[PDB]
């Protein structure tokens, strides 16, 4: 039980102690704190409201020195998200520059950045060019596909 195990276990404990609205995250198994499942529901008044998005978080062994691999298990239409589901955010950018990965960034904070990026899609990485270009070219069509993703995530 090294740094990763101690830290990871403490983080989950807090997630079950003080749970945020629309944020259900935790390890898949008690005998496996390296694979976490995150259910983030898009906040109201956004283009992704009511979107129960399922994401997988694969943590490293030198945690929290290194950032976790967050990947969506469902279809998405976000400029900062690769077509394969890999999330690209400066907060998870390991330095081997205002926003970078830091051991002080808990999973709770990591999720906050994702929720914030969902409300304000700020393309800094440029993963989903189809969306990144559309976001600026046609805000109307973007909202159409965005809300469509909500239907697909909720299963409607």
């Amino acid at each position: 039980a090294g740094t990763a195990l101690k830290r990871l276990m403490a983080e989950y404990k807090q997630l079950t102690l003080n749970p945020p609205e629309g944020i259900v995250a935790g390890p898949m198994n008690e005998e496996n704190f390296f694979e976490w499942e995150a259910l983030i529901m898009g906040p109201e008044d956004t283009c992704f409201e009511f979107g129960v998005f399922p994401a997988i978080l694969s943590f490293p062994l030198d945690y929290p020195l290194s950032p976790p691999k967050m990947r969506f298990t469902c279809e998405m239409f976000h400029p900062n998200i690769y077509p394969d589901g890999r999330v690209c955010i400066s907060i998870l950018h390991a330095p081997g520059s205002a926003e970078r990965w830091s051991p002080v960034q808990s999973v709770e904070k990591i999720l906050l950045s994702v929720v914030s990026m969902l409300a304000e899609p700020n393309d800094e990485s440029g993963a989903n060019v189809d969306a990144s270009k559309m976001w600026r070219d046609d805000r109307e069509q973007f909202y159409k596909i965005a809300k469509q993703i909500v239907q697909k995530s909720l299963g409607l």
């Binding site: 749970p19 629309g22 898009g42």
Partner: peptide, 27 residues
């Protein structure tokens, strides 16, 4: 303990989802 939390967690993910659905539609 081992699985007390496991079930608890599954419930939160389930509820939350069903809620979003109730919402999205009632909206």
């Amino acid at each position: 303990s081992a699985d007390e939390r496991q079930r608890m967690l599954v419930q939160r993910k389930d509820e939350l989802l069903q809620q979003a659905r109730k919402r999205f539609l009632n909206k």
